Symmetry: D2
Subunit: 116 residues, 4 copies
């Protein structure tokens, strides 16, 4: 599994469950093409977005739909979403975990990049 997302909720001290995530890849014409999407599980994790074969070199945007997550919990958050934009596989195949920590007016995102 070459592309990982893991989301935590800094208000509840829990995984952030059912968080929608949309992945895009920059096309040759410089537009964002839809690449993959999904929702975090009970554990706050999202696996199986892509395969090594399909996950080629490129610039990727991981959109984490934070506003919808917070709204459902009765909180009016600041951000529309978190977007994490990065070049992937530009030195051969890697495994990426995008880790996000969510508060209503703040978020952090960290990448864990490993060589399999």
């Amino acid at each position: 599994c070459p592309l990982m997302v893991k989301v935590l909720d800094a208000v509840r001290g829990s995984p952030a469950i059912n968080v929608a995530v949309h992945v895009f890849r920059k096309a040759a014409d410089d537009t964002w093409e839809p690449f993959a999407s999904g929702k975090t599980s009970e554990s706050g994790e999202l696996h199986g977005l892509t395969t090594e074969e399909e996950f080629v070199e490129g610039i990727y945007k991981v959109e984490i739909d934070t506003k919808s997550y917070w709204k459902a919990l009765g909180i009016s958050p600041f951000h529309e979403h978190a977007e994490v934009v990065f070049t992937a596989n530009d030195s051969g195949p890697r495994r990426y975990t995008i880790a996000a920590l969510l508060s209503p007016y703040s978020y952090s995102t960290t990448a864990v990049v490993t060589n399999p």
Copy 2:
């Protein structure tokens, strides 16, 4: 000053100086329109981006060119840029400070909305 940006460097423990920042507003057709830009000062701050007259309710994107910042320090970063997308509202508090803390493989962003 309705909209300020402050950027800090978590590796050097300093303001992040000369970081390019580009602000966009979402247009009716859902495309991003350039709105304002600048570079952070020696205090890591960017002021005078817009005015209260111009800064109307709407969706905005603040783009922070973190990749160029790290490259100028000889450090290989993960992100192309940091991206902060939000709705500006007239209701609640109306001075917006977008704060950002930068590491090569991590960033955090916080909004300070005051009266």
Copy 3:
């Protein structure tokens, strides 16, 4: 002002106001000696903790009473307090800003060391 503290609230997007802060210096016997204290202002800041004459090289602990802050907002927090421990050095930059971002089950702290 050799040592400043700024505290932000990540739930409300505001300065963290009236947060008690206690500063300690490590004594020769490795015990913590009270050094300075105060409460954050309406801007979430604490100034005038010490002077350049008094703020000598040594190990310091800045304790931020986050638990009481959350309790006053009716929110159940994880931590007893935030704890920031560091060596003050004369060599490098010498205005220290201890910045802290608070969530109920999370906090971040950053040091801004300037010239």
Copy 4:
């Protein structure tokens, strides 16, 4: 496993390996008694610190030895260590993960608390 530590390195985008961790518990006389210690593994994780039986109600301090970690990588960091202080098991047994993200002049710590 009722007490978890997981540490990441925000400079290298990797787990923080061989990070020393010391756990203390507040005694009846208000002193910090040594409770458990260990080092993060290749995955940045530390397991097996304690057992449900030994992990009773109390106030705990998790000290993460960040300064030694950074020094070995040739970086002079700001903090001596991270200390995470919390009441545990004060409403019955829980499982705790203390998650830390490290930069030379900054750190964050989040708790993930689950009911088994």
